[PDB]
């Protein structure tokens, strides 16, 4: 009966029925997004009304709509017509990916470009990439996708090994017409194949790896109730799933003695953008928001036991809607398990003669998604000591291009004639804080060096300083690794036994943020990625750092607009948005399939407890 | 027969015999340090001549000596008298530790200070801390230790919970004289106990943790031959142990096809210092060089199966010398095992229909040491993909003090009246590089942002630059996380199939470096800690960033002096010295025993291989 329970296949089927009956789901309509709405602030309203938010696309060219329906009452709460040229286009439909390659296949300009390169059109795959917004005036209001070509020699061939550079096309997926085909010149299509399962490339497989058996003879230490409510080593939370954000953690709390203390109300990766840094007109427009434009949850993989998740795994199989409102189950799309995490605490004391050692553990909640050539793993970790951590694992096949004769300052060579354009993978973690309640505040903590002199005659002293962020206008912060800068979220009304406000400290990896020029389209559309940390006043409609309709939006939506309200965040219901990412200069080692690389962040208790919260852990 | 084999009990006894025969080890002598000497560069002697280096202390006050002997030929190669007042005192002897408390127990000044605080001398433990170099003229040429007091209420009581602030004494451990007793005033001695094994504090132990079983039915995948030669998943290396540095990795190489390719000739933590930032006269002199002054290997813990090292573990039991030259085994002092490391590579390709997933693994070589209140774990990891990583784990009990009534800018409060002085844990990793051989060079790589304009009209382009460090004078580098700065060690004479010099990229955590004022004693003595990266030309006698004798030694030796030679490091036999550490502002959560915190670095291949080196990893 939990208001945070996962959507059922029936609920999605009910939304479909409601929409159809209301006349909002005709033959020309398509569901571009469908997700359950979280309970509003204030559970005073007995029995929560299960509501779903829906983005309805019209393949006829008619205006799309944002609809809210109550599955509890079987009614349409609201239906608003959208002006895409103003507020942005709806997310890309899976069924739209195909149209790009199919439409180009009969376009004379495209066929001529391929003929010149002696490429069989039946062997040319086309990657359907988001368009963004640039100098093409005829695109505003129009739903466009840009296509880049790759040759697939045979059904099981990895097309990524054969990019067709010097060629790009733009297509209007609704009017179904190729608006433009640009051919800047022929580039040799890389010849070597990148088939990592081909013995000629892998060579003899290793026979040196002995098995590692990870088991739990008495089962897991965590309990799953209500389908998605998790309880593990004092932790309490609800694992939700949204087609846009993927796995979302709700009501993260820690049982400290006799009371369940909240830490974070909602944690999610609210956006993920991959900006490319190759100035070639063939790719200079390339920026794909996996979350905002494509909806990462939608492409979550079914995780195979023993391969994707090892040990004693408890799966969750979330259900999403297809383009027509039919429920589709993502079998084993979410993995949950606990794993040993080395030494937790250790000390051999000479004076007391007591030797003490305790092991650590982490609760893991994860899912893996595939976006064309890339595959991303999203992992949330809960540690015994109260630490919360997120880790993104980037793998898959690198997006390729030709490697220019004479080299390049924006592309690396991975194989003969094969290039890999420089790019970044930048995430935004939206953390709706609730440190011992909703009355929170954020402080920027910097290490402070001291000069040798009076009060510090030996010049050994060093300190720290904390600055409270009181208004949103001063809540857009940058990292400063040199000064060990961190951010503390505390509750000025809840103090520990030492009369100090309880808190949690966010430790960032301090990786580079968005590198693009400040005046670029991407810097405007993904402004969140230009700064490491943002703090906003909580608001029901401020869900994504990039706004609700990212696709082809002119820019400034999301965080820049929210922050413009300059609201009070000093001891209020606030939300922390942390930007973190990888800057990728592909290596030869990343080809033909790249080894996982990682990035993340974590929050550790900072005077939240009255002493170590793991003194009750057994020797085992 | 391997010249990189661990020292045997026999060799140590032989050294003792040689020294005795040479008249260098009479009853007044003590071995302060003893270690095997690594073989010199180039195949010198027809066979392998085993040599040991020893620092001989004299308990009567006579000048100590540095001696090198050949255990094979039974001769003293060299023996030099040391002028400690100039070049430094020898490492602290374990037997000198107790001298401090013993001598103070009968000193009138000390007794009066304790009486003024109503403390029973029989219950006052004294921490024997390194003295360093300050303004005390009488200390020149004397082996001094400074003592700080802690009250131990009973045999199994954690004295750290009861610091006696406002009091410190200096002691000459050779002449057995208390040179000074400083009392700046009485401070209340914190009353609360910090006994983490007392049920009154731990409360009932958790019964919610279910067992996690990690086993290897067919045994480990790595082989150990010649006692310490490891071969695992293409990696090859020798695990050495030195009483000063602890675990040292030799000849790290990777089998790429038919050739064994060297990567790192020698890897070790050449120094680690813990500088305190409390300006109080009671502790403003506190800086302990665990490695250089105390010799961390000496205090390596015997690691218990299931507790310290979980899974299928293979142990090494290194042997060291005791103060008299007798061999002493550190039973199970080194743990070696492989562990699963999640997903290695993964891609679900729509076009080819091929779904691919491979898991990762890492080889772990570690040891754990105890220095008074702190306990440090040293971990070296080797991954399937060629990555090499080091991780230090800091735990134990925080060093305490009283917490001043009016608060403090250099101490945090852990409990009523109990303080924890701010401090840092800074390590120095000495990496004698050998990327495909000894002809190496280092390049500093920074991300390069580009301005929007001609050639980059959309302002999306970004690049990078590499600067070769050609001379030691330009090889003292700082971190720059904002620009994603890394350092690449390459071999300009060994190129991959794409005609690019093979290399490895060092990824630092970019944590703050030494915070002390540049004019402080510690900034001079721990000069290496002020910069993130140093590159020197290899030399037989340049072993530690702080020189051979750190104890009570001024600046003048170590890295700053090595760099002054301004030698050519562009395509030469070079050594990388990486500084990395933790800046600790103790939290209430760190008391009464602190949960592990970590810091480290890693090196990933950068065009070292011609493609991913893990394509031959099997599915299962
Ligand atoms: Cu990438
Ligand atoms: Cu510390």
Alpha carbon distances (Å) from B421 to A229, B91, B135, B556 = 41, 25, 22, 29
Separation of alpha carbons A185 and A314, rounded Å = 53
Alpha carbon distances (Å) from A415 to B11, B296, B525 = 52, 46, 49
Separation of alpha carbons A550 and B87, rounded Å = 66
Separation of alpha carbons A606 and A208, rounded Å = 45
Query: Is the Cβ pair A612, B397 closer than 8 Å?
Result: no
Q: Decide if B458 touches A, using CB distance below 8 A.
A: yes
Phi, psi torsion values for A87, nearest 5 degrees: -100, 0
Residues 277-316 of A with CB under 8 A from B: 277-279, 284-287, 301, 304, 306-308, 310-311
Q: Are A129 and A287 in contact (CB under 8 A)?
A: no
Q: What is the DSSP letter of B534?
A: E
Separation of alpha carbons B215 and A213, rounded Å = 5
Does the bond joining B305 to the residue before it have cis omega, within 30 degrees of 0?
A: no
Query: Is the Cβ pair B523, A459 closer than 8 Å?
Result: yes
Mutate to test the interface with B, among A159, A302, A588 (most CBs of B within 10 A): A588
CA A89 to ligand 1 center in whole angstroms: 26
Residues 521-540 of A with CB under 8 A from B: 521-523
- Among A87, A110, A139, identify where a domain stops: A87
Q: Decide if A605 touches B, using CB distance below 8 A.
A: yes
Structure-solving method? X-ray
B110 and B244 housed in the same domain: no
Residues of B in contact with A372 (CB under 8 A): 350
Mutate to test the interface with A, among B407, B416, B461 (most CBs of A within 10 A): B461
Separation of alpha carbons A28 and A324, rounded Å = 10
B451 and B363 housed in the same domain: yes
Query: Is the Cβ pair B447, A345 closer than 8 Å?
Result: no
Q: Please report the DSSP string for A97-143 in residue order.
A: HHHHHHHHTT-HHHHHHHHHTT--GGGEEEEEEE----S-GGGTTS-
Separation of alpha carbons B487 and B604, rounded Å = 11
Tell me the residue length of chain A.
Answer: 620
Separation of alpha carbons B254 and B265, rounded Å = 12
B141 and B240 housed in the same domain: no
Q: Decide if A361 touches B, using CB distance below 8 A.
A: yes
Token readout for B566 is 């301004």
CA atoms within 13 A on the CB side of A79: 15
Range of the domain at B99: 94-195
Residue B605 burial (10 A CB sphere; 0-12, 13-18, 19+): buried
Residue A294's nearest CA partner among A374, A239, A366, A240 is A374
- Residue B245 maps to which CATH number? 2.70.98.20
- Among B44, B66, B87, identify where a domain stops: B87
The radius of gyration of chain B's CA atoms, rounded to the nearest angstrom, is 26
- Where do we find the tokens 């939240």? A608
- Residue A137 maps to which CATH number? 3.10.450.40
The radius of gyration of chain A's CA atoms, rounded to the nearest angstrom, is 26
Considering its fold, how many domains does chain A have in total? Answer: 3
Token readout for A81 is 């017509």
Helix (H) or strand (E) holding A596: strand A594-605
A144 and A264 housed in the same domain: no
Q: Are A69 and A15 in contact (CB under 8 A)?
A: yes
Query: Is the Cβ pair A595, B304 closer than 8 Å?
Result: no
Kindly identify which residue of chain A lies nearest to residue B479, measuring between CA atoms.
A482
Q: Are B579 and B531 in contact (CB under 8 A)?
A: yes
Q: Decide if B565 touches A, using CB distance below 8 A.
A: no
Query: Is the Cβ pair A512, B458 closer than 8 Å?
Result: no
Ligand with minimal distance to A277 CA: 1
Residue B219 burial (10 A CB sphere; 0-12, 13-18, 19+): exposed
What is the C-alpha end-to-end distance of chain A, expressed in Å? 37
Residues of A in contact with B278 (CB under 8 A): 460-461
Separation of alpha carbons A39 and A250, rounded Å = 11
B189 and B206 housed in the same domain: no
A131 and A60 housed in the same domain: no
Q: What is the DSSP letter of B139?
A: G
Report the gap between the CA of A20 and the closest CA in chain B (Å). Answer: 32
What is the count of residue pairs from A and B with beta carbons less than 8 Å apart? Answer: 455
A189 and A215 housed in the same domain: no
Separation of alpha carbons B459 and B179, rounded Å = 68
Q: Decide if B494 touches A, using CB distance below 8 A.
A: no
Residue B276's nearest CA partner among B400, B118, B162 is B400
Residues of A in contact with B481 (CB under 8 A): 479, 481-482, 510-512
Query: Is the Cβ pair B517, A460 closer than 8 Å?
Result: yes
Residue A31's nearest CA partner among A85, A109, A96 is A96
Separation of alpha carbons A170 and A177, rounded Å = 9
Residues of B in contact with A233 (CB under 8 A): 206, 208-209
CA B373 to ligand 2 center in whole angstroms: 10
Q: Are B462 and A410 in contact (CB under 8 A)?
A: yes
Nearest Cβ partner for A587 among B409, B482, B607: B607
User: Can you tell me whether residue A351 is helix, strand or coil?
Assistant: coil
Segments in A235-312 forming alpha helices (H): none
Ligand with minimal distance to B395 CA: 2
Separation of alpha carbons A569 and A471, rounded Å = 5
Residue A79's nearest CA partner among A92, A90, A94, A68 is A68
Q: Decide if A595 touches B, using CB distance below 8 A.
A: yes
Q: Are A125 and A151 in contact (CB under 8 A)?
A: yes
Sign of the alpha-carbon dihedral angle for B454, B457, B461, B462: positive
Ligand with minimal distance to A400 CA: 1
Q: Decide if B152 touches A, using CB distance below 8 A.
A: yes
Token readout for B392 is 């230090």
Helix (H) or strand (E) holding A327: strand A327-329
A404 and A324 housed in the same domain: yes
A485 and A584 housed in the same domain: yes
In degrees to the nearest 10, what's the CA dihedral of A147, A151, A157, A159?
A: -40
* Spatial CB neighbours of B115, under 8 Å, sequence gap ≥ 6: none
Query: Is the Cβ pair B343, A393 closer than 8 Å?
Result: yes
Does the bond joining A227 to the residue before it have cis omega, within 30 degrees of 0?
A: no
A393 and A504 housed in the same domain: yes
Residues of B in contact with A385 (CB under 8 A): 589, 595
Kindly identify which residue of chain A lies nearest to residue B350, measuring between CA atoms.
A372
Alpha carbon distances (Å) from B521 to A450, B70, B117, B133, B135 = 15, 38, 32, 7, 10
Report the gap between the CA of A76 and the closest CA in chain B (Å). Answer: 37
* Spatial CB neighbours of B200, under 8 Å, sequence gap ≥ 6: none
Q: Decide if A406 touches B, using CB distance below 8 A.
A: no
Residues 216-245 of B with CB under 8 A from A: 216-221, 233
Token readout for A540 is 């029901």
Q: What is the DSSP letter of A311?
A: S
A377 and A444 housed in the same domain: yes
Token readout for B539 is 């030399």
Token readout for A289 is 């928001």
Separation of alpha carbons A353 and B269, rounded Å = 28
Cα angle for residues A436, A442, A446 (degrees, 5° grid)? 125
Separation of alpha carbons B58 and B68, rounded Å = 17
Q: Decide if B125 touches A, using CB distance below 8 A.
A: yes
Separation of alpha carbons B341 and B353, rounded Å = 26
Tell me the residue length of chain B.
Answer: 620
Nearest Cβ partner for A460 among B203, B375, B520: B520
- Among B195, B223, B252, identify where a domain stops: B195
Residue A162: CB atoms within 10 A of its CB come to 25
Token readout for A407 is 């080299």
A167 and A218 housed in the same domain: no
């Amino acid at each position: 009966a939990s208001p945070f329970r996962l959507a059922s296949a029936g609920e999605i089927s009910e939304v479909q029925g409601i929409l159809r009956t209301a006349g909002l789901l005709g033959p020309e309509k398509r569901i571009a997004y469908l997700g359950v709405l979280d309970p509003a602030r204030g559970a005073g309203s007995e029995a929560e009304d299960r509501r779903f938010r829906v983005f309805i696309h019209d393949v006829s060219g008619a205006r799309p709509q944002e609809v809210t329906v109550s599955v509890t009452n079987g009614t349409v709460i609201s239906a608003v017509e959208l002006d895409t040229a103003a507020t942005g286009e709806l997310p890309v439909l899976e069924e739209e990916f195909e149209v790009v390659e199919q439409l180009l296949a009969t376009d004379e300009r495209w066929l001529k470009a391929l003929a010149a390169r002696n490429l069989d059109v039946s062997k040319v795959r086309v990657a359907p990439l988001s368009a963004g917004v640039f100098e093409y005036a005829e695109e505003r209001g129009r739903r466009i996708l840009r296509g880049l070509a790759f040759v697939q020699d045979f059904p099981e061939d990895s097309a990524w090994a054969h990019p067709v550079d010097g060629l790009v096309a733009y297509v209007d997926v609704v009017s179904k017409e190729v608006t433009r085909v640009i051919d800047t010149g022929v580039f040799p299509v890389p010849a070597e194949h990148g088939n990592y399962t081909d013995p000629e490339l892998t060579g003899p497989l290793r026979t040196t790896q002995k098995p590692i058996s990870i088991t739990q003879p008495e089962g897991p230490s965590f309990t799953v109730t209500g389908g998605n409510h998790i309880e593990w080593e004092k932790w309490s939370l609800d694992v939700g799933f949204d087609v846009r954000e993927g796995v979302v953690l709700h009501n993260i709390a820690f049982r400290d003695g006799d009371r369940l203390r909240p830490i974070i109300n909602r944690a999610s990766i609210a956006e993920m953008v991959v900006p490319y840094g190759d100035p070639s007109p063939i790719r200079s427009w390339q920026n794909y928001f996996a979350t905002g434009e494509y909806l990462v949850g939608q492409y979550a993989n079914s995780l195979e036991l023993g391969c994707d998740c090892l040990g004693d795994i408890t799966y969750l199989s979330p259900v999403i809607s297809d383009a027509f409102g039919n429920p589709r189950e993502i079998r084993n799309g979410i993995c949950m398990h606990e794993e040993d995490w080395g030494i937790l605490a250790k000390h051999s004391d000479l004076w007391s003669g007591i030797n003490y050692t305790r092991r650590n553990r982490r609760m893991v909640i994860s899912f893996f998604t595939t976006i064309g050539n890339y595959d991303y793993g999203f992992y949330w970790y809960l540690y015994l000591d109260g630490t919360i951590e997120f880790e993104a694992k980037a793998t898959g096949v690198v997006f390729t291009s030709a490697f220019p004769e004479g080299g390049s300052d924006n592309i690396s060579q991975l194989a003969p004639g094969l290039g890999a354009p420089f790019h970044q993978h930048i995430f935004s973690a939206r953390l709706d804080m609730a440190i011992d309640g909703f009355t929170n505040r954020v402080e920027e903590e910097d290490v402070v060096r001291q000069t040798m002199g009076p009060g510090n005659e030996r010049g050994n002293a060093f300190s720290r300083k904390r600055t409270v962020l009181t208004r949103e206008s001063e809540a857009v912060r940058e990292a400063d690794a040199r000064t060990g800068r961190t951010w503390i979220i505390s509750n000025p009304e809840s103090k520990n036994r030492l009369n100090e406000p309880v808190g949690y400290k966010l430790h960032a990896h301090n990786q580079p943020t968005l590198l693009a020029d400040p005046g670029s389209s991407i810097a405007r559309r993904a402004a969140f990625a230009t700064k490491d940390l943002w703090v906003t006043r909580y608001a029901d409609d401020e869900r994504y750092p990039t706004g609700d309709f990212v696709n082809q939006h002119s820019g400034g939506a999301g965080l820049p607009s929210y922050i413009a309200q300059d609201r009070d965040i000093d001891g209020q219901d606030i939300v922390v948005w942390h930007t973190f990412g990888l800057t990728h200069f592909p290596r030869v080692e990343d080809w033909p399939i790249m080894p996982v690389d990682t990035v993340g962040f974590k929050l550790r208790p900072e005077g939240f407890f009255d002493r170590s919260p793991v003194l009750d852990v057994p020797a085992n």
